[PDB]
Structure 1
Amino acid sequence: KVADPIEGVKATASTDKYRNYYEIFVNSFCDSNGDETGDLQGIISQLDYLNDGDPNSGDDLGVDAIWLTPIMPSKSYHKYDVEDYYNIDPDFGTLDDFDKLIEECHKRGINVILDLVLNHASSKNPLFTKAVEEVADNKLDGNAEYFEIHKASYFDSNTQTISLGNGYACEANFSQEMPEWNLNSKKTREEFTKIAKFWLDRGVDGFRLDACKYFTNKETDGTEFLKWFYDTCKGIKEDVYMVGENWTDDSDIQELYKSGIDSQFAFKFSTSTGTIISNIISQGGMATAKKIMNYDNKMAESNPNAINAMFLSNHDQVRSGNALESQGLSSQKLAAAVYMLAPGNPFIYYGEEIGIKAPNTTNDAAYRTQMVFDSENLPDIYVNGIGDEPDVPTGGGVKQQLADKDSLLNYYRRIITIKNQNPEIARGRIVGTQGFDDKTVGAYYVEYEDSKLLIIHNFSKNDAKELTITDDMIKNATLRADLIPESSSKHTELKDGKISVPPQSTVIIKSA
């Protein structure tokens, strides 16, 4: 019977770089034409589920940016081997379907970034097939100049290669079908400028940049390359946004931020062995708050405009729900609150919001299962390596979960609404932790210019925490928002300076 503190509070749609992102593995999301392959028209058909354009009404998820996995011609179902950087794979649609998707996203306040694969191309990209022919004729000063082609003996020993003619090879860390670009090449830079402009001119808001760890090599400074590319794209589109996958230690992420790239994925906090899920299982609130503050701030030293990119899991990892669901739905809910209420831009993986699991932990295809909009009418999508038979989410599909006020999905929805009511959360920096003499409680102050919030998480699985909020912490403290997983009907309150934070709950404190 305690009033919901967010009732009637005005939400505002984001109009800047700060977004709750949604990663769509295109193959697996929505099939509009019966071939068992997801496509762009399928995404279009579900845009009102993603964002209906009105932050103050409706039953949409509410995400305000999409990251599309590769959409360009490729023989593979994942398409990270790019055969043509200037078109749409026919299974996904045409450039007209792409233009429709952009228009329809933007009408709803949804930004769109593309997976732009700069480390490597397909071995069937025509630029590369020409290089291969020319190398076989001992011509190295044509198309070979686009690619990381050298005599075999040049390569660092632990570098995998593609064998070419006449004793030459091409760097290929990921596959024999993924030859690497020479990022130092004049010709390559020219080509990348053309590809960037091609997509930016179609209304794209920016890029996800895979495999940044492999920009740097024996002769390439990846920071120099990414700075060159990023600044090129800023000239084309001043408010272009990029997020890099740099799957490596913190010091390498610090280094790469000197490029001025907005964001790099925060791998440290992802997966079952990562900070967030590990500490939700271990009930380590205080540790998690400390680690988020220290990491966000360290990265800001390298780039003062860094936008951290928190995530539980992506298309290259086991689904987060494989670890979290067996710990109870309230653990899954807390996890969402923790990663999404950290500074920066969180990335929800499609289907995470309804608890899609991986049927096995070892096969990448099992990380990319079929999105379930309605568990009564299961999808019919083929995913190479796991077939087309759909798993049923424990909580049902989108339609089921939207109706149930206590669903995982509705918890995500509420998190997003709280963010749309409180811009400081995404845009600010953590200026300090707040101790509550309890290792289960993780609390920190996020401040964005003139405005500070106190975010408190109770990681305890079983125990409510009665906390005292003083004027030294937040002057004239009020309860701005709550997230209480046990029941959507349950709210708390701040009364005579005391607030009960239930198990696995989050509260947000703000000055009157």
Structure 2
Amino acid sequence: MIGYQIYVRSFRDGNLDGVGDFRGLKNAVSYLKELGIDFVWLMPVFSSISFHGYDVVDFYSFKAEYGSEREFKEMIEAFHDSGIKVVLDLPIHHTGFLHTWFQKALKGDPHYRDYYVWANKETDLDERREWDGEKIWHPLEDGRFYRGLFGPFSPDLNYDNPQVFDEMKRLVLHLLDMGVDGFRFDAAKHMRDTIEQNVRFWKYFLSDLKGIFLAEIWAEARMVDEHGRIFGYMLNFDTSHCIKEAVWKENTRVLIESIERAVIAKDYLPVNFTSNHDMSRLASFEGGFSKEKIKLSISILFTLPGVPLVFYGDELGMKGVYQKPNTEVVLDPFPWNESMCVEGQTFWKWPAYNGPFSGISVEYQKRDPDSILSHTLGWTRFRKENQWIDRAKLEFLCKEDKFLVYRLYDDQHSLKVFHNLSGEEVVFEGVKMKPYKTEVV
């Protein structure tokens, strides 16, 4: 199993307007299939006014710019015809400020008023986030305060209200009933105010539901476990980082610690990725790094158990440094050819980090056997033929400073991995591990 994270608007255009849409997604299948992609994780396809669409104004209507509900379905159909699943990012933790539910709660409506979170005499208004620490309590003139973790325009939904519960669960059944193979529950970590409350929440919420359930609980390995089992697919921020950090600091330690810590034997499938939209792209890790180091990070990712996910463009090494509040710098148009002028190319805005003629397009890299894509095409094909590695067991045979070597095995398999993090050859079991290379014996 190999995933691929797509930002719809930047992937492929299907109606000749430069804006990525459902039809173009549909025509990109060959690329995905040639990339050995099993399922696509599609960032917010629901109508919101933002560019990233995490503040949904309606879950029952799609983004006009991506397409119609009919077009959405023919893309689902098509993807299946080609054996690929489709997982939709679902930010049900909060609705946009303009969602009709919030618009009503605001205008006094009682039924919807309970759909959201408001300040109570016994509530701390100076309460801030655990990370950036900006307040979560936002004021209305009528002295009213509704809580919103991710800002005043992403009002948190009351998941205490058993009405919201069904209100939403009915939706999950809707998209599923429509074809959606799975969801990527956006912010799964914050559905309720206490760790214990959230676990049970998901317990009930996913009760009688089948399909890929990917959760985003950006936290300490320890917590991800508790939910772990319940979803079946947990986003492994731990290792996703540690691979790059280890390759960067040319040291196996943290990777070894994180492998044992966040991968080894889990009641669920840790989803390990190259990078995502909330951080700098693989190719820009810590002031960006070596073309050969980028590959090594991709090799390690595909030679470790769990489910390997690639954020669209990472297989080409697209550049991008995370920034605020213009987070669209890491959502550049996917470069199909060098001129970025081809039936299908997106160009809704001029590229921030990845412009035309950069030598990083699909049509450019496809040729040079030394390219990051040609390389990734290598491990994606390998991992396609070795789906037994998903649950495979790991056994370290070498924990040196600049190199790692372990063994992946199951009842009827056993493969030995050789990762050299230094840029100077080292030997193990007769094997001559080259600089910054993964060998597979």
Whether these two folds match at TM > 0.5 is yes
> Aligned-residue CA RMSD in angstroms?
2.4
Q: Give the counterpart letter for 2:245 in structure 1.
A: S
Deviations 1:92-121 (A, max 9, x none): 101111111111111112111001111101
Partner of 2:263: 296
Deviations 1:187-216 (A, max 9, x none): 111111210111001111111011123223
Partner of 1:505: 437
Partner of 1:120: 94
Aligned residue pairs, count: 430
Q: Which has the larger radius of gyration?
A: 1
Q: CA deviation at 1:446?
A: 2.0
Name the CA distance, whole Å, in 2 between partners of 1:131 and 1:172: 14
Identity of aligned residues (%): 24
Partners of 2:334 and 2:346 within 8 A in 1: no
Is 1:466 paired with 2:427?
Answer: yes
Partner of 2:117: 148
Structure 2 residue corresponding to 1:256, chosen from 227, 234, 238: 227
Q: Give the counterpart letter for 2:217 in structure 1.
A: N
Name the CA distance, whole Å, in 2 between partners of 1:219 and 1:126: 30
Q: CA deviation at 1:423?
A: 2.4
Is 1:81 paired with 2:55?
Answer: yes
Deviations 1:411-458 (A, max 9, x none): 11110111122222222232x21126x322212222333433222211
Structure 2: runs of 5+ lacking an equivalent? 129-134
Structure 2 residue corresponding to 1:447, chosen from 386, 399, 409: 409
Decide which moves more: 354-363 or 89-98: 354-363
Q: CA deviation at 1:38?
A: 1.4
Partners of 1:381 and 1:388 within 8 A in 2: no
Partner of 2:132: none
Partner of 2:361: 397
Name the CA distance, whole Å, in 1 between partners of 2:200 and 2:249: 41
Name the CA distance, whole Å, in 2 between partners of 1:448 and 1:371: 38
Residues 393 and 111 (structure 1), Cα distance of their counterparts in 2 relative to 1, 3 Å cut: farther
Partner of 1:242: 213
Partner of 2:284: 322
Is 1:181 paired with 2:163?
Answer: no
Is 1:279 paired with 2:246?
Answer: yes
Paired residue secondary structure (2:4): strand
Decide which moves more: 388-397 or 77-86: 388-397
Structure 1 residue corresponding to 2:275, chosen from 313, 316, 328: 313
Name the CA distance, whole Å, in 2 between partners of 1:207 and 1:96: 19
Partner of 1:42: 24
Q: CA deviation at 1:91?
A: 0.8
Partner of 1:428: 392
Partners of 2:320 and 2:330 within 8 A in 1: yes
Deviations 1:260-284 (A, max 9, x none): 11122222234xxx31112112322
Q: CA deviation at 1:464?
A: 2.2
Is 1:376 paired with 2:350?
Answer: no
Partners of 1:61 and 1:409 within 8 A in 2: no
Deviations 1:4-50 (A, max 9, x none): xxxxxxxxxxxxxxx21110111211223344421111211211111
Where do residues 126-137 of structure 1 align in structure 2 (5 Å cutoff)?
Answer: 126-134=100-108
Q: Give the counterpart letter for 1:147 in structure 2.
A: Y
Q: Give the counterpart letter for 1:421 in structure 2.
A: E
Deviations 1:370-412 (A, max 9, x none): 11011123455235xx778961474331011111211100111
Structure 1: runs of 5+ lacking an equivalent? 1-18, 52-59, 469-497
Is 1:211 paired with 2:187?
Answer: yes
Residues 251 and 286 (structure 1), Cα distance of their counterparts in 2 relative to 1, 3 Å cut: closer
Paired residue secondary structure (2:62): coil
Name the CA distance, whole Å, in 2 between partners of 1:126 and 1:203: 26
Q: Give the counterpart letter for 2:300 in structure 1.
A: V
Residues 392 and 320 (structure 1), Cα distance of their counterparts in 2 relative to 1, 3 Å cut: farther
Partner of 1:265: 235
Partner of 1:332: 294
Partner of 2:376: 412
Q: Give the counterpart letter for 1:420 in structure 2.
A: K
Q: Give the counterpart letter for 2:262 in structure 1.
A: Y
Residues 26 and 148 (structure 1), Cα distance of their counterparts in 2 relative to 1, 3 Å cut: same
Residues 26 and 293 (structure 1), Cα distance of their counterparts in 2 relative to 1, 3 Å cut: same
Name the CA distance, whole Å, in 2 between partners of 1:268 and 1:127: 36
Name the CA distance, whole Å, in 2 between partners of 1:205 and 1:358: 30
Name the CA distance, whole Å, in 1 between partners of 2:370 and 2:412: 35
Partner of 2:315: 353
- TM-score, normalised by the number of residues in structure 2: 0.90
Partner of 2:131: none
Name the CA distance, whole Å, in 2 between partners of 1:201 and 1:308: 26
Partner of 1:474: none
Partners of 2:329 and 2:353 within 8 A in 1: no
Name the CA distance, whole Å, in 1 between partners of 2:66 and 2:88: 14
Paired residue secondary structure (2:107): helix
Q: Give the counterpart letter for 2:115 in structure 1.
A: Y
Name the CA distance, whole Å, in 2 between partners of 1:125 and 1:48: 37
Name the CA distance, whole Å, in 2 between partners of 1:388 and 1:499: 42
Name the CA distance, whole Å, in 1 between partners of 2:138 and 2:304: 42
Q: CA deviation at 1:82?
A: 0.8
Partners of 2:114 and 2:158 within 8 A in 1: yes
Decide which moves more: 212-221 or 367-376: 212-221
Partners of 1:277 and 1:324 within 8 A in 2: no
